[PDB]
Amino acid sequence: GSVVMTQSQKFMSTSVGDRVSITCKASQIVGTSVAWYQQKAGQSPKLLIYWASTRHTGVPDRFTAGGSGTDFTLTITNVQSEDLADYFCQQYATYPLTFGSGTKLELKRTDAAPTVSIFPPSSEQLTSGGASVVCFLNNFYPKDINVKWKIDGSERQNGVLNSWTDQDSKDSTYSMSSTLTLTKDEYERHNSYTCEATHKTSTSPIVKSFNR
Amino acid sequence: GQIQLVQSVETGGGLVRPGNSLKLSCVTSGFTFSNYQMHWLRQPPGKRLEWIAVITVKSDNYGANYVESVKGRFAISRDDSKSSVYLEMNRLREEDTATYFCSRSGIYDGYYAYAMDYWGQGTSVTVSSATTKGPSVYPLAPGSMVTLGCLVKGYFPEPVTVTWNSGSLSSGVHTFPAVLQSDLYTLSSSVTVPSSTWPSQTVTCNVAHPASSTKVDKKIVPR
Amino acid sequence: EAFKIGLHTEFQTVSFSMVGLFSNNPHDCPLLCTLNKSHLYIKGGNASFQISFDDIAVLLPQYDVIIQHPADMSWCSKSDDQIWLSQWFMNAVGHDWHLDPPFLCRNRTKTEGFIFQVNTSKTGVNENYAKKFKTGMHHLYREYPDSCLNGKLCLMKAQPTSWPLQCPLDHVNTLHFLTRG
Amino acid sequence: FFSWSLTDGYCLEEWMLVAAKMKCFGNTAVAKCNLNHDSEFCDMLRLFDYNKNAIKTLVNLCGQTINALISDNLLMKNKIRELMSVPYCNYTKFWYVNHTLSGQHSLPRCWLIKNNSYLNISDFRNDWILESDFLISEMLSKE
Ligand SMILES: *[C@@H]1O[C@H](CO)[C@@H](O[C@@H]2O[C@H](CO)[C@@H](O[C@@H]3O[C@H](CO)[C@@H](O)[C@H](O[C@H]4O[C@H](CO)[C@@H](O)[C@H](O)[C@@H]4O)[C@@H]3O)[C@H](O)[C@H]2NC(C)=O)[C@H](O)[C@H]1NC(C)=O
Ligand SMILES: *[C@@H]1O[C@H](CO[C@@H]2O[C@@H](C)[C@@H](O)[C@@H](O)[C@@H]2O)[C@@H](O[C@@H]2O[C@H](CO)[C@@H](O[C@@H]3O[C@H](CO)[C@@H](O)[C@H](O)[C@@H]3O)[C@H](O)[C@H]2NC(C)=O)[C@H](O)[C@H]1NC(C)=O
Ligand SMILES: *[C@@H]1O[C@H](CO[C@@H]2O[C@@H](C)[C@@H](O)[C@@H](O)[C@@H]2O)[C@@H](O[C@@H]2O[C@H](CO)[C@@H](O)[C@H](O)[C@H]2NC(C)=O)[C@H](O)[C@H]1NC(C)=O
Ligand SMILES: *[C@@H]1O[C@H](CO)[C@@H](O[C@@H]2O[C@H](CO)[C@@H](O)[C@H](O)[C@H]2NC(C)=O)[C@H](O)[C@H]1NC(C)=O
Ligand SMILES: *[C@@H]1O[C@H](CO)[C@@H](O[C@@H]2O[C@H](CO)[C@@H](O)[C@H](O)[C@H]2NC(C)=O)[C@H](O)[C@H]1NC(C)=O
């Protein structure tokens, strides 16, 4: 029965000086009983807005907000670098108090293709009885990217562990790691292992492969 | 005075096994603690912030409210003479793993409401039956610029620190967030150096896991 | 003040002390004060409410306690004085428990605090009610500063407070409160 | 006869008056308060006297006998006049004519307010003229 606070856009890109809007839709009518918060690096949140449109003391006037019933919008004008953070809503009209999932505000930059590198299992791990094939895809923008593991041409989704990085503080870029872990036997059965990445910087997929 | 909310784990650490108990504390200053209601919330990994409990003031009999998932397990309490609020968590289960926050709510446009105007710094709580294990460190060498790697597999608990040549190569290093599998953490670290640097020069990843008092150095030797 | 009308006839005055009347009243009489244009106050027994008017729906019917009958207000508080003062006020202002729209209070199970809310918006189907309510307030608060504008949303909230020390003591409001309740 | 009777003329205690000095009114003036439901001054006297008696007797609930102390119709008249934006009585300041030589004086009447200000003297002169007349007559009706 909890009120769901829906923030459908998990990531939003902007440039310094732009105006950005972050939306929130409550699954029930909550009037103006809504707050907005900023949070960085999973640290302590900071109150931005309450009663839907009232700015909290100490908050820059770049931040405004409005809405009612179910629809609420936080607007940041003349976005500054220090405004790059997660933003999320809250309803306090009824128990349990509930919060939105959050919208991460990130910086725009020129498109960049990933640097892809594939690495085979190490003899140390193989002696231990396992075999991990690692694939790095570094320094690409935007964060949208699709990675596939292909063994002898066939896609594999059993035994893949992926990890991502947030937008890099220096070059405003993203990076991903993908590890396909098999046992020594399943690994020795095949020959060709391929990391195939797809990104809007290339019509065809980037591909790296290791044989034997 | 500066308004402060600082959290701590009363006894032991934030790492506990299911069925155990754990008391969080939140000590405050800079305001008349006894005039404000105090809350506990939690942010689970990859999930939205969650309200847990609230306790009001003496004039309202220190009344408390809880979310259903903790009713009968957690107990919020306060000590006004110490300006502190506490959360006693019993019958802990793995779903209780999260960063816990204490918070203050005040009065907003003239009306009391549970918007949170001050928060504590956060306290990491991990409920797990996994036993501590040191990482297995595996080199990742390929089969202008060259990329190498270091695979840190099968360790618990976090954290683990990874450097390359004791930091000399931090310029082109990507250390990725750990991922949990089989109740053990696994991460990878990549480093990009000029082809003139490797393999002519030694490139080594240094991985330290303090929990198990493990320190490993793996040189990336060519294949 | 005083001046001479004739040679041996004088215009003279006598001014009653509100401090004296209130402080030396052995009865627990209800006090009604207009602190300024936005904040009103009412005190009875151990209960003391600040009354404010603005467009914030602090309470919502979906989540808060609907009051149709006075007895419903048993769910608004743990203090019989708060309930009694709220019922007394709604009676004195002219609220018709039978025919008028129900109002709202916060369930005492919640810890945000006691508060009750009345929709006094002078608009649409509520206009008549709002008007009546306005008239009621005009009788209870001498020189009532009506903040509710025509056609605009206006919700009254009454919540616990400490009696403002700078509140002008006006016994006429008390007389009307006793007369109308 | 549901009307509280005043019995002491009548002397007002220091705490009843802003001047903080006891002030006594003669029997001739105060006797007019008996069964007079058209005098805000008598209403105030009855309020203060009922409260003084309550103090001396020590507690009841407030206003149970309110209609024995104050005139409801006169209160409603003053309210209506307030809402019509005409001068009205807010039951605080009262004026009277005093024959200082003999001490004979009229029954105090309300000093009316309008827009939160007491009327200027002239704006109700016909009142304190009339009262003075009455007073003189009363005096010579005693001599
Ligand atoms: C307090 O009382 C007031 C007055 O009674 C009340 O405000 C009014 O609420 C009604 C709804 O009950 C509002 O009616 C709207 O008015 C116009 C047409 O007159 C339209 O905007 C609306 O209809 C359209 O829009 C809706 C919104 O999306 C749609 O759902 C609908 O299908 C239509 O497309 C609707 O009829 C009325 O406007 C207000 N009046 C004012 C002045 O705001 C208020 O809700 C009460 N508050 C509480 C807390 O009890
Ligand atoms: C009518 O009077 C109310 C009640 O408070 C009155 O005014 C105060 C300034 C003092 O003289 C009080 O003794 C007196 O009761 C006024 O409401 C109050 O408004 C003030 C600001 O004008 C609020 O204080 C400020 O609030 C903000 C947010 O908290 C801060 O930036 C400041 O630090 C400062 O404290 C005060 O909280 C508020 N009180 C309530 C109960 O709401 C009201 O403004 C006044 N109306 C008019 C039209 O004058
Ligand atoms: C006032 O609230 C009580 C308690 O309700 C609980 O707390 C509320 C703030 C809200 O979160 C509810 O969902 C909670 O259940 C109501 O009485 C309880 O109602 C529940 C309904 O499931 C019932 O199981 C309990 O036994 C009830 N407890 C008691 C003591 O009666 C009560 O009905 C509410 N009053 C009104 C007028 O709605
Ligand atoms: C009756 O009305 C008069 C006139 O508005 C009030 O007398 C004034 O009171 C204010 C404070 O409320 C003072 O600042 C003024 O000096 C008073 N005016 C004078 C003495 O001429 C009086 O308070 C009202 N009575 C009540 C009970 O509210
Ligand atoms: C009417 O005026 C007379 C004359 O001032 C007042 O009576 C005097 O009161 C003063 C002050 O207390 C005394 O010093 C005089 O001795 C009194 N003289 C007489 C003859 O009484 C009287 O109090 C006034 N009455 C009212 C009702 O105000």
Residue numbers in the entry:
A (entry chain L): 0 to 211
B (entry chain H): -3 to 52, 52A, 52B, 52C, 53 to 72, 72A, 72B, 72C, ...
C (entry chain A): 60 to 240
D (entry chain B): 253 to 260, 269 to 318, 326 to 410
Article passage:
NW arenaviruses present a glycoprotein (GP) complex on the envelope surface of the virion, which orchestrates host cell entry and is a key target of the immune response arising from infection and immunization. Each protomer of the GP trimer consists of three non-covalently linked subcomponents: a stable signal peptide (SSP), a membrane-distal GP1 attachment glycoprotein, and a membrane-anchored GP2 glycoprotein, which are the result of proteolytic processing of a single SSP−GP1−GP2 chain in the endoplasmic reticulum. Here, we address this paucity of information through X-ray crystallographic determination of JUNV and MACV GP1−GP2 heterodimers in complex with the Fab fragments of neutralizing antibodies.
Constructs with cysteines introduced at positions 88 and 329 (termed JUNV GP188-329GP2e) and 88 and 328 (JUNV GP188-328GP2e) resulted in the highest yields of purified protein. JUNV and MACV GP1−GP2 are recognized by Fabs JUN1 and MAC1, respectively, at previously characterized epitopes located at their TfR1 recognition sites. The introduced inter-chain disulfide bridges likely restrict the size of the HR1c (α7) helices, thereby preventing them from merging with the HR1a (α6) helices and transitioning toward the post-fusion state. Interestingly, the extensive glycosylation of GP1 Asn95 in JUNV GP1−GP2 contrasts with that observed in reported JUNV GP1 structures and may be attributed to stabilizing interactions imparted by GP2, or to the effect that construct boundaries and the expression system may have on glycan biosynthesis. In JUNV, this connection is largely defined by a tryptophan in the C-terminal (α9) helix (Trp395), which is strictly conserved among NW viruses. Accordingly, the distance between the membrane-proximal β1−β2 turn and the most apical GP1 residue is 80 Å in JUNV, compared to 70 Å in LASV.
